[PDB]
Design a protein around this ligand. Structure first.
Ligand SMILES: Nc1ncnc2c1ncn2[C@@H]1O[C@H](COP(=O)(O)OP(=O)(O)OP(=O)(O)O)[C@@H](O)[C@H]1O
Ligand SMILES: Nc1ncnc2c1ncn2[C@@H]1O[C@H](COP(=O)(O)OP(=O)(O)OP(=O)(O)O)[C@@H](O)[C@H]1O
Ligand SMILES: Nc1ncnc2c1ncn2[C@@H]1O[C@H](COP(=O)(O)OP(=O)(O)O)[C@@H](O)[C@H]1O
Ligand SMILES: [Mg+2]
Ligand SMILES: [Mg+2]
Lengths: 315, 340, 324
């Protein structure tokens, strides 16, 4: 806790904080770490008021553990199923995508990560009729492709016009801009708890590697902390507010010593919940929209299954 | 030592002093995160520091292309040219060699590269009106001994070749004393020579032309087909050094190259039997690439050898060709032979 | 709850603040700077600058973006098939990169794009400016003059064929000296100079708001020599790409970059691949490659988020970049 303010907890006065900060104990952490008896009798303060203040301070700052069954019945209805257009992951994901998890796609140049993001966003916005927020960091969005994708499913101008206005796009090219955008989204959705419509349910980040890649390198440590903080806030957003978050990434060394692995080192590997490794086919059948999709990490189903996805003829 | 005059706050300059940063080149060498971790201070002040350092290093004049076009005397590199000594060759090259960048001359043996190099060495000492630069030249022999006898013969026959220039100032010109000759034997020796001896000659103003007798000769005796990376590193370093010197002192650099056959089983050579050596890494360092070819007795059964000088690529020259002959006076192009 | 790590704070003030035990700006917002300075042992200047930087740090949807990109036009190339394959020319607000073997026509394309960006809106241009940054010294004014003369001849021909007064009204201003005064020239002989010029670009673009094109003719040369440390090169390249895309999106530009090809001995038959490693591969929005085939120049699109890859032929005439 910082400086004393009125309304933080009942029964606070300036004498209490003056004596406590004179006794080298101001913050809540060391006040609760120190024995209540020690500060109670050593400083001579009243025991009843002290214990009441400590209990009311912990209660208003804590998270009370809850039973499991009740939250299970509530999550039975809180969750949702989002389909993109292919069932390769759908069958291997307990027959439905999870709203409230951190899934991501790792793919190289020309793999089709942003194509998957675009088609998924179009399907979510048009078919299911919910607002969706898209974050771009390398100029990978073009509205003409969105219009072309929408036209492949509808032939009415009014539906195309209405669908576009529910897709919100914001440009962030530095990690601070991305953090500010996500914090603003968190604040706005926290203020919009009363409302039932207009709240975005799917959040897409076009490229998390490009923003944070310049921050890596050297022998320093602030880049790892920044990326960990970004991951933590993304996870808190997705869990607490029940949003589906999708991000992209790149691959690393393909040499003999190191297999094809996602970028951002080992620390980023623990962040996401689902991994989809897009790839291109070789030999006959190459080029076009023919891309091989695989599921590396799911933590819910067996992995190592390879499928086929076409984009050129899809939408 | 130099950032003191920059406007700033005492904290950032104290951090710079504690971090042992010398000049603007040192601070521009490092990147954002490196400077952030060295100075241990916030990002916006780093951005301000970079902006101020960049504004100090450059960014004063708004130079448009009118200043490049109209102001002929302000930018000699864009208009002044080094004449080759023959009007036909100059017409083919639209004036002569550029004063910036590297110009390559490639071809098989007995094609006439050394004669052209000697003629360019002699032609640089003429006044600016006659297509010269009023300076000397540097010759670096990398393969064998310098041909002094041919140089003396060319110097003796010089009055006959320069028919247009009147001869009163020709006797004043001391051709022999304004040509410097160097010898090398290794790649490292050539690198040391270009790193140390050449800048001394160019800076003091003795010469304004650099000629390498055979750049490919040292590199073909050390590196095999399995050692491409060190050769590429050395070629990149040599090209960077040569380009920097040429840009700094406004002195043309002429490089003489050898060729290798196609050995048909790309780079623009489809039906050509020979191609310039040293691969594509060396080809990326050049500006104007020439090629001198000679058709053997099979096509030269007419009585005299057939020589053609061809332009391969250039930012401002179409692919063309002409013909020339070698005589006791020098290299002369055949009139009315340019191909379109 | 906003962690202090997510703010551009100096490490010293951040570390002392978190040593004090504050982990949210919501309570830093109302603390008086006097006791704030007294508590954490700082002065007023750092307190006020931290407060302002914390407090300082739009809603555009797909329809607005579609309308905006329809308002602004495309940069003509004078190659009809190349315009058709690219969707109408070089797009704005995106980074375009061109690769190819030496002496293939990349500099000619850059010169043509510099000339073509000044076509009046009536004929179907963008009517903007151009910034040319040269790192190799291959900028010759004579070729630009010839290209501009050919362009003005073609423009006069089509204007006369149309027989429209409004077309004539946009030609007397379109003279050789006027268009050739709208190209701003720089020269960076070292990668440090190039980086410094890049840092100085935003103010220059703020001064001259009519610029709609930035050309960097050659980025491989400054970075492919005298740089043993690969990690530093990678960091510099990533930072440069991020800055360039930020400039393009902020000032509504069309960044043009030029690269180089490198032989790769795969299997046993060597083939040409773009340089600067594989991490750089997806640092550009659009990637173009110029082939040689057999005496025929081909412009093959490689990576783009809008159109499928195909192949188009072209050639260079004494008038510039042309089709057929
Ligand atoms: N790192 C990346 N950043 C952005 N986009 C990427 C990335 N990696 C791959 N892509 C996308 O992968 C796609 C694969 O190329 P492809 O030519 O198949 O797409 P396309 O132009 O959308 O095709 P079509 O119009 O035929 O559907 C590219 O369009 C590109 O946008
Ligand atoms: N009077 C002459 N004096 C000298 N050479 C003459 C004369 N007349 C004709 N030539 C021709 O000049 C040519 C000189 O060849 P040159 O030394 O230039 O060949 P190169 O292979 O390019 O040289 P280098 O291997 O030294 O680079 C000879 O092939 C010779 O036939
Ligand atoms: N005035 C001209 N007329 C006709 N063709 C030209 C003219 N100037 C240059 N060219 C051709 O255009 C090409 C330019 O290539 P260039 O831009 O130098 O490639 P790079 O930039 O990769 O070095 C050359 O191959 C040359 O043949
Ligand atoms: Mg010779
Ligand atoms: Mg070029």
């Amino acid at each position: 806790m910082g400086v004393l303010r009125v309304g933080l907890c009942p029964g606070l006065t300036e004498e209490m904080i003056q004596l406590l900060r004179s006794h080298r104990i101001k913050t809540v952490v060391d006040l609760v770490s120190a024995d209540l008896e020690e500060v109670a009798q050593k400083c001579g303060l009243s025991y009843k008021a002290l214990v009441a203040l400590r209990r009311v301070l912990l209660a208003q700052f804590s998270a009370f553990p809850v039973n499991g069954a009740d939250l299970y019945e509530e999550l039975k209805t809180s969750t949702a199923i989002l389909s993109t257009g292919i069932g390769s992951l759908d069958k291997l994901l307990d027959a439905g995508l999870y709203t409230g998890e951190v899934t991501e796609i790792v793919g190289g140049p020309g793999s089709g990560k942003t194509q998957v993001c675009l088609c998924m966003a179009a399907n979510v916005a048009h078919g299911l009729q919910q607002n969706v927020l898209y974050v771009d960091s390398n100029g990978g969005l073009t509205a003409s492709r969105l219009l072309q994708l929408l036209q492949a499913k509808t032939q009415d101008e009014e539906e195309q016009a209405e669908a576009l206005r529910r897709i919100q796009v914001v440009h962030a090219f530095d990690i601070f801009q991305m953090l500010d955008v996500l914090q603003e989204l968190r604040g706005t959705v926290a203020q919009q708890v009363t409302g039932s419509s207009g709240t975005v349910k799917v959040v897409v980040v076009d490229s998390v590697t490009a923003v944070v890649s310049p921050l890596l390198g050297g022998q320093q440590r602030e880049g790892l902390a920044l990326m960990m903080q970004l991951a933590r806030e993304l996870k808190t957003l997705a869990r607490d507010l029940g949003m589906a978050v999708v991000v992209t990434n790149h691959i690393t060394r393909d040499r003999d010593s190191g297999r094809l692995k996602p970028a951002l080192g080992r620390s980023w590997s623990f962040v996401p919940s689902t991994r989809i490794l897009l790839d291109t086919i070789e030999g006959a059948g190459a080029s076009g929209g023919r891309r091989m999709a695989c599921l590396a990490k799911s933590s819910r189903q067996p992995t190592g299954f390879q499928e086929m996805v076409d984009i050129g003829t899809w939408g | 030592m130099d950032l003191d005059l920059l406007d700033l706050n005492p904290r950032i300059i104290a951090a710079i002093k504690k971090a042992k940063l010398k000049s603007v080149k040192e601070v521009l060498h490092f990147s954002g995160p490196d400077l952030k971790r060295l100075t241990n201070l916030s990002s916006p002040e780093v951005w301000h520091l970079l902006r101020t350092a960049s504004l100090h290093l450059r960014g004063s004049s708004i130079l448009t292309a009118l200043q490049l076009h109209q102001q002929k005397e302000r930018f000699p590199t864009q208009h002044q040219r080094l004449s080759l000594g023959c009007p036909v060759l100059d017409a083919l090259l639209r004036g002569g060699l550029p004063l910036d960048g590297i110009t390559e001359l490639a071809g098989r043996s007995s094609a006439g590269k050394t004669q052209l190099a000697l003629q360019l060495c002699l032609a640089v000492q003429f006044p600016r009106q006659h297509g010269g630069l009023e300076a000397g030249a540097v010759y670096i022999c990398t393969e064998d001994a310098f041909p002094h006898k041919r140089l003396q013969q060319l110097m003796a026959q010089q009055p006959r070749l320069r028919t247009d220039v009147p001869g009163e100032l020709l006797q004043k010109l001391r051709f022999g004393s304004q040509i410097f000759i160097e010898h090398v034997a290794d790649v490292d020796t050539l690198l040391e020579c270009v790193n140390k001896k050449v800048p001394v000659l160019l800076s003091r103003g003795m010469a304004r032309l650099v000629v390498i007798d055979s750049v490919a000769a040292p590199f073909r005796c050390e590196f095999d087909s399995q050692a491409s990376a060190p050769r590429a590193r050395h070629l990149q370093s040599l090209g960077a050094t040569l380009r920097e010197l040429s840009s700094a002192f406004q002195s043309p650099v002429l490089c003489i190259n050898q060729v290798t056959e196609a050995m048909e089983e790309p780079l623009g050579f489809w039906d050509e039997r020979v191609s310039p050596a040293l691969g594509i890494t060396w080809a990326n360092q050049l500006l104007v690439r020439l090629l001198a070819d000679r058709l053997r007795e099979e096509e030269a059964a007419l009585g005299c050898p057939a020589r053609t000088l061809r332009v391969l690529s250039a930012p401002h020259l179409p692919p063309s060709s002409c013909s020339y002959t070698i005589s006791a006076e020098g290299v002369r192009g055949t009139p009315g032979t340019q191909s379109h | 709850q906003r962690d202090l790590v997510s703010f551009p704070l100096s490490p010293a003030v951040r570390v002392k603040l978190v040593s004090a035990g504050f982990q949210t700006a919501e309570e830093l917002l109302e603390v008086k700077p006097s006791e704030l300075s007294k508590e954490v042992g700082i002065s007023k200047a750092e307190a006020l600058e931290t407060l302002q930087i914390i407090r300082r740090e739009k809603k555009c949807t797909a329809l607005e973006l579609l309308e905006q990109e329809h308002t602004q036009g495309f940069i003509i190339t004078f190659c009809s098939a190349l315009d058709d394959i690219l969707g109408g020319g070089v797009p704005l607000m995106k980074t375009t990169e061109i690769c190819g073997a030496p002496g293939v026509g990349k500099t000619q394309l850059c010169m043509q794009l510099a000339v073509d960006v000044q076509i009046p809106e009536c004929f179907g241009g963008v009517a903007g400016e151009a910034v040319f940054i040269d790192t190799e010294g291959s900028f010759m004014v004579d070729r630009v003059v010839d290209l501009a003369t050919a362009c003005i001849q073609h423009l006069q021909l089509i204007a006369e064929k149309h027989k429209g007064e409004e077309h004539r009204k946009a030609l007397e201003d379109f003279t050789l000296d006027n268009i050739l005064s709208h190209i701003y020239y720089f020269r960076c002989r070292d990668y440090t100079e190039l980086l410094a010029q890049v840092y100085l670009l935003p103010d220059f673009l703020s001064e001259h708001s009519k610029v709609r094109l930035v050309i960097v003719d050659g980025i491989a040369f400054p970075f492919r020599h005298d740089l043993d440390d690969l990690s530093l090169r990678t960091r510099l390249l990533n930072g440069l790409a991020q800055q360039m895309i930020s400039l393009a999106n902020n000032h509504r530009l069309a960044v043009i970059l030029t690269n180089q090809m490198t032989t790769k001995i795969d299997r046993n038959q060597a083939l040409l691949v773009p340089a600067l490693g594989e991490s750089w591969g997806h640092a550009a929005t659009i990637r173009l490659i110029f082939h040689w085939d057999r005496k025929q120049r081909l412009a093959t699109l490689y990576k783009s988020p809008s159109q499928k890859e195909c192949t188009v032929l072209f050639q260079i005439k004494p008038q510039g970049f042309r089709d057929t």
